[PDB]
Structure formats: structure tokens, C-alpha cells
Write a protein that binds this ligand. Sequence first.
Ligand SMILES: *[C@@H]1O[C@H](CO)[C@@H](O[C@@H]2O[C@H](CO)[C@@H](O[C@H]3O[C@H](CO)[C@@H](O)[C@H](O)[C@@H]3O)[C@H](O)[C@H]2NC(C)=O)[C@H](O)[C@H]1NC(C)=O
Ligand SMILES: *[C@@H]1O[C@H](CO)[C@@H](O[C@@H]2O[C@H](CO)[C@@H](O)[C@H](O)[C@H]2NC(C)=O)[C@H](O)[C@H]1NC(C)=O
Ligand SMILES: *[C@@H]1O[C@H](CO)[C@@H](O[C@@H]2O[C@H](CO)[C@@H](O)[C@H](O)[C@H]2NC(C)=O)[C@H](O)[C@H]1NC(C)=O
Ligand SMILES: O=C(NC[C@H]1CCCCN1)c1cc(OCC(F)(F)F)ccc1OCC(F)(F)F
Ligand SMILES: *[C@@H]1O[C@H](CO)[C@@H](O)[C@H](O)[C@H]1NC(C)=O
Length: 1138
Amino acid sequence: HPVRRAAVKILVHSLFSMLIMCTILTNCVFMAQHDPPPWTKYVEYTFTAIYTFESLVKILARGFCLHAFTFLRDPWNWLDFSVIVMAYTTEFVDGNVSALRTFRVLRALKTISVISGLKTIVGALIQSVKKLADVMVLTVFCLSVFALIGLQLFMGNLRHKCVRNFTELNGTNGLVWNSLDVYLNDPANYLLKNGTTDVLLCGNSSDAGTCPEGYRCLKAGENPDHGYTSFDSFAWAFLALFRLMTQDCWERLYQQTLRSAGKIYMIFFMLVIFLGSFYLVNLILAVVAMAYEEQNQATIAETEEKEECCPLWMSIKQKVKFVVMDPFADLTITMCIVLNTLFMALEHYNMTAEFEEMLQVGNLVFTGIFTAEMTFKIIALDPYYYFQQGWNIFDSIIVILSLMELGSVLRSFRLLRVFKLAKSWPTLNTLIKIIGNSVGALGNLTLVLAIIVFIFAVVGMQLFGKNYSELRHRISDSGLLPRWHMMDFFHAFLIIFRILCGEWIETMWDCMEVSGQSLCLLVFLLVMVIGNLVVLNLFLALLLSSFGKVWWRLRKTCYRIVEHSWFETFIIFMILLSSGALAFEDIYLEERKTIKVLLEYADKMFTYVFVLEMLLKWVAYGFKKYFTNAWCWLDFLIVDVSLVSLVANTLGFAEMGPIKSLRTLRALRPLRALSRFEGMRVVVNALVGAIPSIMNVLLVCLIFWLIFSIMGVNLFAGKFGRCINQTEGDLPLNYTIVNNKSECESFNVTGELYWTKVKVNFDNVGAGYLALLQVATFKGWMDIMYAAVDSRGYEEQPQWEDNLYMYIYFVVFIIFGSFFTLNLFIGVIIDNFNQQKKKLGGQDIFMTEEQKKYYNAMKKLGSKKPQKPIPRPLNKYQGFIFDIVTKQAFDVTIMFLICLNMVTMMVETDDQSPEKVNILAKINLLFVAIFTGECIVKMAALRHYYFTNSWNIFDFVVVILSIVGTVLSDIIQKYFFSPTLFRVIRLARIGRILRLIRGAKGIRTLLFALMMSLPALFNIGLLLFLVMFIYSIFGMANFAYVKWEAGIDDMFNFQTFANSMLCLFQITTSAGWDGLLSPILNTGPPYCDPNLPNSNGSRGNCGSPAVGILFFTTYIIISFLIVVNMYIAIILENFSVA
Ligand SMILES: *[C@@H]1O[C@H](CO)[C@@H](O[C@@H]2O[C@H](CO)[C@@H](O[C@H]3O[C@H](CO)[C@@H](O)[C@H](O)[C@@H]3O)[C@H](O)[C@H]2NC(C)=O)[C@H](O)[C@H]1NC(C)=O
Ligand SMILES: *[C@@H]1O[C@H](CO)[C@@H](O[C@@H]2O[C@H](CO)[C@@H](O)[C@H](O)[C@H]2NC(C)=O)[C@H](O)[C@H]1NC(C)=O
Ligand SMILES: *[C@@H]1O[C@H](CO)[C@@H](O[C@@H]2O[C@H](CO)[C@@H](O)[C@H](O)[C@H]2NC(C)=O)[C@H](O)[C@H]1NC(C)=O
Ligand SMILES: O=C(NC[C@H]1CCCCN1)c1cc(OCC(F)(F)F)ccc1OCC(F)(F)F
Ligand SMILES: *[C@@H]1O[C@H](CO)[C@@H](O)[C@H](O)[C@H]1NC(C)=O
């Protein structure tokens, strides 16, 4: 038929796909708008018309009722049918809620149907979620187990607050309240943690927060920040542990818990962090990588299987070719490029006039140099080369661009010259290859990601815009717009970007406080899971596609005594005790007047014994076999430091600058441990066995962040210093009161006004590097961005959102500097570890010889063939019962009963009700009776069911311990009752839940992989604990007495050793390190008080910026590299065992 022919031709045409695509794109640009004019209503009709016309084309290109069913058969078409009927209904009939008008975002999905490769990527991205099923089950299982643990441990524990004393009068029941009635409604009376608008927590233990004089603490209170962080009511415990699993702002929950319960529970938090968070996240990584790998093999595999005048002009041309035949000056011009990078790099905030003049002079110099090079090389060999070769293309592009610029985004063009260093730099060539594959092979998947971000940004914006705009007061401190809202579309895209980066809870609290918990949790959890999944798939695709006789006498005695094991154990326990003596060096020495001199003599004895064994090594091994090992160098340097410190102590001239400014370097004393301990040694050989690759890629990222930092100097410089007034510690008042720095210096007639910059800012390339590290690591970036998207003038006060669209600077950076630079680091580092494994031919690293024995035996532990299957008991009743229990049904019955027990354990909260405690206790007795019955029958299977297999003895011991738990819990009243000793007997009930590992198979395999990785992780964490130790002692001697600011409260400090190890624990996960650097960087008043009384003679309460940045940046790099070791061990183990 004619109609059918026409329809088919249109359906197959290549032009109408472009039609559809442009219509969808314009629909998207019309959809991103909030409160559109009434004009757009007819454009909506136009869009519906085009959509229905295309649907008509498709159904008539099939051309019958059955054909319509065939059109419907393609699942992507269902989306189009739904959207046409939805547009038709929304025009036909609309009491009126009009909520359906956000369903038009489904049209944006049609892009993935029209593009040739988009649906391919989305279909290959669903299979990853289908492989991720076992890890999702294990993740929710661990989250549930840890949720029950934290629920019993911290039930309603976060509620604690610092309430002002209780005033009780005999009569009834400046006062005027009635106990519970006044207190819950009390809040203002509550004590507000200093420097923050949050309730302060407390604790009855002698480890939680000390409450000031006049403030006792009682569980009676509403909840923490907004009511969503509470640990009671297992639902919210599952929320808070999903938060500790994504590590989203987990330092806040960690600080709040340990402020409530007691600093001991950092054991719980580090158990969750180092086995729940890290291990589950890296298992997700591993399984996504494995699926992709299989697809690549198959995908790669499937592809593989296939069946002026003319004579003067010419003369001068030939002669100039003869003159400049050979430039061969790439070294000269590359040194010119390097000098130009260094010359632009010499920009800063307050540049002297002559300095800026010299900058411009060298500017013109280098521009002339580069034009000269281009002209000579274009009149040298051939202009068809500068026509063809893209290298010459962009060289000349930069030439013309610089000329146009000489003819503050202005200087963005000069910084293009930096890139051409890549032609001889294989590593920067690899980063260039990565950035190219981003928009090349993986361009379709980047498109999937962009479409997803768009869909969610427009969904959220017109789901919560009215709410964010009218309930704005319930979301911000003062009457103002929020810093993060969804009313516009730029801001909704920023919220979805933030959620992509990994920080969702802190804006979901707002979205729930304004909109409503159900759908807000729905959309944010959805964007979390989906967006992080596509980001993970993109990251992994890129990282994959990147590829006399007394002399003899004494010397023999010395050899025998040095190879004597008791001597080695002597020095081992010696260095242990010396590290301890270091650990006792906190601020409370002045109160410990005996341990002072005890450790004095101890230090003298340590340096004596160590120089003694040094001399023994000297006279025994000879100056060659000694100075050949590097650890001997390490011991020699350390004893050298201690000896010079000691001799300068005794022989006068000490206790002033250097020296005694070196005795803090004594905190390297633990470093002797790496030499002797067989695990730290192998892991360190694996780490410094990578400094080549690490330093290469760090130079690459230093050049790239140099580009970005120079851009940041030009855009922001001096544009950051607010001039905030003294009483409130915030931005001045408004732009009008104090607009300019030249105005606050006029209005400072009273000493109230200060014009002080933000701590981390862009004023050099140094602080530029620092602000980029903070931003690209995601911790501490809130301050940089707020100050930058407030930057109005050059020294003018910042209005609240002027220069708004800068946010795009941090967006483009964060992408190109964290999803790409950290992709380079990770990819190269992982490749390096793989190469090391291949070279060792052993293929195993981080494990010593005995650890290899453990590993092989544990691998053998997975023996598949059982013993004699089962003996029939030869007895009548034993036979009947053995038949009724050996059936595979019996296991499923017990499994459902124990999942019902789990659900019984999920439903307790704090202060539930007495009758509820009774019902739950009776149900506990009932389940322990059922399990005792299962136990006795199993033991009566024949004779040995409770000894044949490890799972059975686990069942047996948990049954016994549950019986004991009941028989002790009912007799609490007779002998003695305790508040906390009951919780431990209550918590061993979690043992029953762990039965579920048996019937489950995926959970068993993944947990077994973790078990096989436990020794490697042990050695790695041993090195990490040693590093926490070194750094904690260094900070204890260094970072003590610093002012109490954002990340350093009374409980989390560097004063004692407990506090330092805690702060360093949270900084191990890169968390909160902005908060701990913030009080070190400040030098000088207003905030600090240089020269202040201290317990120790040393004066001042302000940290050293120079040493603080070194400390924190180096610790982040080291810890990041060691948790890359963790990621690597985990991935190897997973693949190896599954
Ligand atoms: C830390 O020790 C505190 C002192 O023992 C303790 O305060 C006590 O808390 C209990 C409630 O758990 C109070 O008992 C009160 O409870 C009933 C309602 O169930 C009230 O009607 C009565 O007022 C009754 O006294 C104790 O009175 C109270 N004791 C004191 C001295 O204040 C804290 O509870 C302990 N820690 C926490 C956070 O609970
Ligand atoms: C900083 O900004 C202020 C803006 O108020 C500039 O102000 C002088 O301020 C008076 C206010 O009475 C204005 O009428 C003048 O127009 C301002 N001068 C100029 C040149 O605009 C102040 O000059 C600015 N300082 C610098 C160094 O630019
Ligand atoms: C505003 O006035 C106060 C007066 O108290 C200034 O405070 C002094 O600031 C200088 C540095 O500029 C310090 O050296 C002094 O120690 C501070 N006062 C003291 C304690 O003597 C403040 O700097 C002024 N701010 C501006 C922007 O002018
Ligand atoms: O690699 C990233 N590292 C950032 C960590 C490193 C350790 C310390 C704290 N910050 C990384 C950076 C991202 O920035 C935003 C986006 F790229 F999404 F746009 C997003 C995801 C990222 O990693 C997720 C992945 F890829 F592993 F799935
Ligand atoms: C909080 O800050 C105030 C500042 O006035 C100080 O007096 C108090 O000791 C601080 N307390 C804690 C627990 O940080």
C-alpha cells in the first residue's frame, strides 16, 4: 500500500531521526524552565504534535492492529506510548492537583532510543546491576547486622543533651515549667555547642563529653540535627549505617556518637569503617569491574571473530628553505614553554607595579618568540603541514589567540601553551588519552550520565520548587534563600552534582525538612544508587581502556650475638618500650612529676642501648655490609639525631631554637619498627617500590592543577577577603554597610571591623594548590565555593550570589581533576601493583612467608567432597526423626523461623513500653526454645551431627550461649543488676542472625573472600597504625594547644594520645580534614592569640601553617595510597576466589 510504503520510508530515513532529536532537545530546554510564560503552552502542543506524528509514522510503518502490537513489542516504544497518552490526558482532563505535569521528563529518555549507541550503553549498564545482586544482598545484610548492633548499643543514646540543672519543689507537680512538659519544649535553655548552632551532647561514662558547671545531662530531648540521625528505631539505624557505608559526612555521626556514649566505641566505628564501609564499597568496585571485564572480553571477543613576483618569490622560497632547513630546537622552545608556565605562575594577590610591568614585558617577549617559531617553521618546510598536522594547528591557534588577546576570563588562552609538553611525556600522553576517551569511545556513556543528571535535576526542581520557595524559612538560619535549593535549574543541577560527588545526606535533610520524607528519600536514594553506579561504570571503563687473632675472636663473638634471636627480641621490646615512652609525652607531664624523670632516664637508656647495638653492628658487619642496607641507614640517621640532641643537652647550648627544635624529630623513633617486623617490611617494599610511578603521575597532576590554579589566580585573587565584623563572625552586614576594603579601612574607627581572607583561598599558586586539593578531595570545599560564587569585585565585599555562574569553574575542575586525575592515579597505581605481582611471579603481595602458608591452607579449606554422606542410625525412632530432619525442607523451615526471629529483633526501639518488653521477652523465649529443639534433635540425628561440620558446631555454641543468655537475663534481679552489663548479654543475640550465612551462597563467598584478605589487610593496617602513631606523636608535640575551632573540639584534640589517635582515625578516611586544618592555618589575631600562657613553656595557641599543611597533605597522600593498597588486596582476593 502507498501509505505503508511512505511510512516505512519515513521510518527508515536518516533525517527524521535528526528531526526527533532536535525536537527532544528543544523540549528539554523548554522543560528546564521554572514558571514558564503562558506563551509556551502552544509550544507544548507543537511538541505533542511532533511526538504523536512520529508514533503514527511508526504504527503505520507497521500498518495493522497486529503491527501496532509489534510496534509495542519494542520495550523502548512503551515509553513513547505512555508519554503520548500522558500528554493527551494532561490536556484532556486535569480536585485538581496537577502533579502529573512532571511526567514529561520521560521524554528526555527518548534520546536513548533515538541515538544509535545510547541504548546499547544503557543495556550494557543494566547487566552490571544484575551482577551486583549478591553484593547488594550482602550489603543490606551487613547494614542490618551492624544496624542491630548499633541499635542495641546506642538505643536513643544520641538524644543526650546538656540541660541546665533540674529545680524540684515539693509543692505542685525562673522555673514556671513542669518537668517533662517544660524540658522537651525547653531547647533555648539547652546548651549550644560553641561556635555552632547545634545541641551539645553528653554522657554519664567517664569518656563522653564533660558538661560545664551548671549543666547536667539527661536522655530527655528531641533528637540531633533534624531528627534523622537518631540510632533508635532500627529504620533510622539502617539509615545512619547506610550513611556510614557511603561515608557521606560520617565524621559528624562519629563525633556525635563518641560525644554521647563514650570514646571507647571508636572500636565500633572503626570496625564499620574498615570492614563495612571500605570493604563493601571496594567489593561493589570489584564486581562492577568484573562484569565490565566480561563484557569487554565478550564484546572484544565477538568483534575478533569475523569471517611580489613569481621568480623572486620562488627563489626566495627555495633560499629560505635552505637557510632554515633544520630547526631541531624543540628543547629550546620547550624550555621557553616551561619558562612561560613559570612566568605566568609568578602571579599573586598584591603584585608590585614594577613586578606586573615585568610580567607584561615577558608576556610580549614570549608572544613574539612563539610567533617567530610559528613563522619560521611555516616558511621552513611546508605550509601544507601547518594545514594538516593538528599539532601545528593548535600551535597556530594559540599564536593567533595570544595576538587577539594582546589586541577575568581574559588570560584563559595563554594557559593553552602548557599542554604541548605532552608530546614527549608518556604519562601526560596517557592523561591526554584518558581525557580524549572521555568524549570518544566512552562518549556514549558520558551521554548516559549527562542525560541522567538532567532528568533528575528537572524532576527534583518541579517536584520540590514550590516547597523550597514557600517553606524556605524551615531550611535556612536567617531569612534568606538556601545555599543549596532546587527552585531554579542551575541549583537543581548543582544538587544532583553534589549527590554525584558523594555528599547526599546533608541536603536530603533539607529536602525532607521542606518537602516530605517519603518521596524525598525516594528520589535522593534513587539518584544516589543510579548516579553513583553510572559514575562507577564510567570510571572503570576509562581505567580499563587506559591500557691480631683477638680481632677474629671479638668479631666472631659479635656475629654470634647479633644472629642470636634473644638479642633481636631484646631490641624489639626495646623499641616497643621507646615508642611507648613517646606515647606518654602529652600535655599532662607537668602534673606527672615522677614519670617526667622516669622517662628522662628512659630516654638516656634508650639512646645508650641503641648506639651500643649500633657499635656492635659496626664492629661486626663491616662498613660495607652495614651501609648496603637502607634500614641500617634509617637506624643510623635516627641514632644520629638522638645523639646530637643528647650531646647538645649535656654540653650546654641547648633549649633555644635549634637545638631542641630538632627533638620533635625524635617522633620518628617508631620508624625502627619497619625494619624488624616481617609485615611492615614487605608492605613498605611494596609501597616505595612504586615511587617512580607515583612521582610521575603526581608531576602530571601538578602540571594540570597548575593550569587550574593559575586560572584560579586570574579569576579569584583578593576577591575572597570578606571584612566580617567582630561580634558575629560572619560576612559584614550587607554590601552597602562595607562594600570595599578601602571602606572597611575607613569604617574601622572602632577596632570592631576586620578585613580577613578565608583560610584556604586562591591568592598564589601555593594556596591555589591547597584550595584545589581541598575541592578535588571534597572535604572543605563548601567554603571555597561559597566564597568564590560570592566573589563580586577585586577587593569589594561579596554579595550573596553575584558571579553565580562560577560554580561552573569548580564543576569543570572537579570533573577534570578528580574524576580524571584520581582516575590516572588509581589506574597507574593499580597497574603498577599488577606488574609487581607478575614480576614476582608469585603473584601475591603484602603477605610474608608464613602468611603465604596461611593463605594456601585457607584456600584448601574450601574442600568440596564431603565424608561418608550420612549414616542411617539403624534405629526405628531415630530413623524416623532423622528422616524428618535430614530433608532439605527442614533447613528451609528453620531458615524462615530464624528470619522471623531477625524481624522480631528489628522491632524494638527505646522506651518502647513495658508490655512490649514482656511480649518481646516471651517471643525470645519461644525462639530460643525452638532453637534448643532443633539443637537436641540434630544432636540426636545419629550421633555426630553436632560435630561433623563447622556450621553445626557454630549452631551448637550459639544455642548454648542463647540458653545461658536467657537464664542469666531472668535472674538479673536476684544477684545484681547493671545498666551496661545487660547490654552485652543482650547483644550476643546477633549470633543467631549469623546463622543465615549457611543457606546463603553469595554472602558466604564474599565473606570468605574478606576472610582470605584479612592477613594482607592486617599487615597493611599494621603499617597504617604505625603511621597513625608517628603522626599522632608529631602532632601531639606540635599541634597541641591550638585554638578550638571547627574540627578540634574539647573531646577531639591533639592534646592527649587518645584524642590524637582518634582525630587521625577520622583523617585516615580523608574525612573532616578540612575541619582539622582550619585551626592550624590561622596565624595571628583576630582568631588566635599569639603569645598566651600554655601548660608547657612554649607560647601561643595558633598553629603553624607551614607545618600544618605539610602534616595534613602528606597524611592524606599516604593514607590514600595505603587504602589504595586496601582496594588492591580486596580486588585481587575477590577475583581469585570467585
Ligand atoms: C546517669 O545517672 C543519673 C543519676 O543517677 C541518671 O539520672 C536519673 O535518671 C532516672 C531515669 O532514668 C531518674 O528516674 C526518674 O524517672 C522517672 C520516670 O521513669 C521519673 O518520674 C522520676 O523523676 C525518677 O526519678 C532519676 O531520678 C535520675 N537521677 C538523678 C540523680 O537525676 C541518668 O539517667 C543517667 N544517665 C542517663 C543519660 O540516663
Ligand atoms: C571601593 O568601592 C567604593 C564604593 O562605595 C568606592 O567609593 C567611593 O565611594 C563613594 C561613596 O560615597 C562613591 O560615591 C564613589 O563613587 C566611590 N568611588 C569610586 C571611584 O567609585 C571606592 O572608591 C572603591 N575603592 C577602590 C580602591 O576602588
Ligand atoms: C581594625 O582596628 C583594629 C584595632 O584593634 C586592628 O587590630 C589590630 O590589627 C593589627 C594588624 O593590622 C594587629 O597587629 C594589632 O595587634 C591589632 N590590634 C591590637 C591587638 O593591638 C585591626 O587590624 C583593624 N583592621 C583593619 C582592617 O583596619
Ligand atoms: O575518584 C574519586 N575520588 C574522590 C575521593 C578520593 C578520596 C578522598 C575523598 N574524595 C571521585 C571523584 C568524584 O568527583 C565528582 C564526579 F567525578 F563524580 F563528578 C566522583 C567520584 C569519584 O569516585 C567514585 C568512583 F569513580 F570511584 F566511582
Ligand atoms: C566552648 O567555647 C567557649 C567560648 O566562650 C569556652 O569558654 C568553652 O570552654 C568551650 N567549651 C568546649 C567544650 O569547647
